[PDB]
Amino acid sequence: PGASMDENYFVNYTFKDRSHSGRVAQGIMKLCLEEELFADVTISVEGREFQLHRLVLSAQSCFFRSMFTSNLKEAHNRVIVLQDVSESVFQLLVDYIYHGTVKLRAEELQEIYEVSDMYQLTSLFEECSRFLARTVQVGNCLQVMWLADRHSDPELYTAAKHCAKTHLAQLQNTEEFLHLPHRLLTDIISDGVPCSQNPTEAIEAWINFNKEEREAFAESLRTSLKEIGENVHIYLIGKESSRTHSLAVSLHCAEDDSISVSGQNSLCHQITAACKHGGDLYVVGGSIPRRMWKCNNATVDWEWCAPLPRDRLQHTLVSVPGKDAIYSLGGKTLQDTLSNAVIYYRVGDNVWTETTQLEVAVSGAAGANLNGIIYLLGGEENDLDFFTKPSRLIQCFDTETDKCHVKPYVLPFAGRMHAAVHKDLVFIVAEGDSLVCYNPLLDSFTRLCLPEAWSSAPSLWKIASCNGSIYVFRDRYKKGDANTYKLDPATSAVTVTRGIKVLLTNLQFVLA
């Protein structure tokens, strides 16, 4: 305020209180939401009589705002009937509107997606969309795709597209694929079908349904049939100690969930840290200065890349496709000093730079690359007495605006955990059998601990995610077969899957 001759405090000024939001907005939280006292309309769903306010409904769902505001000849009654929603689904909806904690079931999940879009709740619809982006299986990604192009939700129509494009071979015989309109089929094929699924045969088998008139589209479909070559899934790099070598094998999952070896490339120098970027290794090791060797599935010959500045051991190498970069967060120097120097290697130009340092230095952490944010889980850190105490810190170093955003909560455990990104979640495996299902968006931990029957020894469990099903691996086994389990997160059922016959499983190693 600068002036006004009329505002004279002794006769006439103008009151201006700054507590009109801390007493009216925050004030109306017990009279409306918690303790419903004054209710206006009675929405009726099936054979029920709900008592819902006319105020809080129009502040969230704009569709309800149009039905209440637009007074007409039918607005004289306070009983409003609904038709689309069921009796046991509207209650879940009215539980979200008032409180904000709706328990999302499994079977009644496609029903809180169709009705949550007509009411235009832009917060539940953006969460039921993420639910359908991670529960998609090989037999379900043909109705979900049809369910995403009708509501115009590109965050699901693309997440449910990389299920019928990487598994088109099995879908060939299915009766749902035969009725697929030409509009959707020109997107599944054009998205880069892998060669192993026979993309050129699905088109031919599909057009034989209505050859009387469907032959016109046959020529156009074969024009856009971009096929991407087959990659190898897990770069299991075996660090044998009996023989000075490193059998960097490349496991290749089959169609029926069977892993087979596809290369026995070897190196003589020691290994400090390893990372895979797309389809190639970028292992780090050797005597000083810290070198880098890059391998490939088909090359079967190690190349050479730009030397590592700031040589150190126990890195936390991560790799992103949303960023042609390979970071080197954390690590401790040769003099047992926990340093923090995030590096910004690029594959296009073999040159190193430096970026914003971490808030807290960690060594031997876990590298998770969920979304475009690099997550550092676990590790070790010395608090006061020069002694490395196993810490539990979740750092969130970014890649767009480089800054550290340490979360205000800690992990259930600590140590030398190994992470493996799966869909939106980030699975974690501790020094034992305590597999957690940490979610970076909801900030919750749902540890689905396996039965302690197979816990004879405190052996670390390596975890790898490939083809939409994580394969929790096993270290050196007591004179037997490696426990290459195939844990199914949906059912928490662990199944022993063999097919790998290697001699490096007798000793510890690194993974990718």
Add this chain to the structure above:
Amino acid sequence: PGASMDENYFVNYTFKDRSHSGRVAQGIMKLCLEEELFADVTISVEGREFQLHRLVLSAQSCFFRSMFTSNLKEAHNRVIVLQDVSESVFQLLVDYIYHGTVKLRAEELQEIYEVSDMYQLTSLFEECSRFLARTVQVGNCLQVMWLADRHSDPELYTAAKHCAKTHLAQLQNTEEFLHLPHRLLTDIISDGVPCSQNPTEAIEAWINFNEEREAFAESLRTSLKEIGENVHIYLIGKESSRTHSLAVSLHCAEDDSISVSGQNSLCHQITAACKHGGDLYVVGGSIPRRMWKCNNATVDWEWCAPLPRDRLQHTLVSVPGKDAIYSLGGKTLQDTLSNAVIYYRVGDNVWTETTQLEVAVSGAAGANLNGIIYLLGGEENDLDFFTKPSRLIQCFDTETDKCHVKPYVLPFAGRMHAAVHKDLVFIVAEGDSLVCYNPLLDSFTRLCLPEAWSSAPSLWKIASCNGSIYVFRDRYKKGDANTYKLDPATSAVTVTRGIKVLLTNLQFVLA
């Protein structure tokens, strides 16, 4: 956080978004306060018929909540009628329950005082009571007193007593005084009525009334305590004849019978001065650390402990809260500026230094309010050697010691003088630019005084006492003295009696 295995993130969930504060709290303010909609209950005040929401009325009030809740034939009709409320006052309550701006005037201020207390409105009964504690003149010092002792408000009953016991002599002739209840008269007498107002005669008025009220003979006499008046204006100024600085003391009276008081004398020069209680603390001389404490009629200049950190042209304020003489800011002779504080006590004589300020300032003015110390105006220099005036206001907390700048600036800057008055902090700059401060409302107020009076630019000093602003003009061209009274209700500058002060210089004026 955490969970257990009944929360399988593939088929189970507990989705809980911590964002029901911008979609249910912000989405309701614009649907109820700003854009009034979905009205259900109609309030039928006399003459008119308003429409109000059931959720906003019961969220700020309590009488309005315990009345809609009880449906004992009080909410089913929905044509409910309110009584003992005028048409105009209720419209200003809708303006307050809703968006939150009120236009409190003087015509309707007692009706909104009682009505806002009947409806249990909490925040409105903290500025409508501050208003009454701000405009109690002698003529209505008793209609407000009895109003205060009906709703149990100590912020007004203890503020309508300091302004109703000093003017006890004039209230004696008033008819309302003779009808005083026995309880009210007891408290106003036993608070230190000045000896010049004849406290003994006040009881004699009831004695000479002519029964039932005449039985009080020994009562109300043992509880009377008389103290001489000692709060007045201290004036500092050197005569043109000699360098002997004078400290003439004058006191204001309601009868305008100014009597010549003792003329205090002093030898050295003055750097700064403070007014605490009924004594004057003078700093200055050849060495700035000299503390020559003076008084009314003791002619004593006892030298106290010197200041450990010597400063020149600093600010002295008295916050009785801790019987302290806090010396905030200052100037250092070693090509730098001081930021320390030294509060010389009376029975302790301590030199403690607390936390410094946030923005450097020197040669400013200070005014104390309810313990909180405000530093306003002054000058600040920079490494660029630029004489940039400072328009930043500083607050010195009395409880948390959290000095911080305010998100605004004064309308002007330079060398100013400040003197509190009721709940306001008046500001006078170089010219006719009166500005009234208000820490609670965080707002200002000017008067737009024309410059036709200040022909020559000269410093103006302001002193406030007995609820009447006094403004003193400095450096007149050998003419009549200027003791303009600045009654802030309406601009009523009148020259008072021409006392022969004969001081053509004004160093400091303290009230």
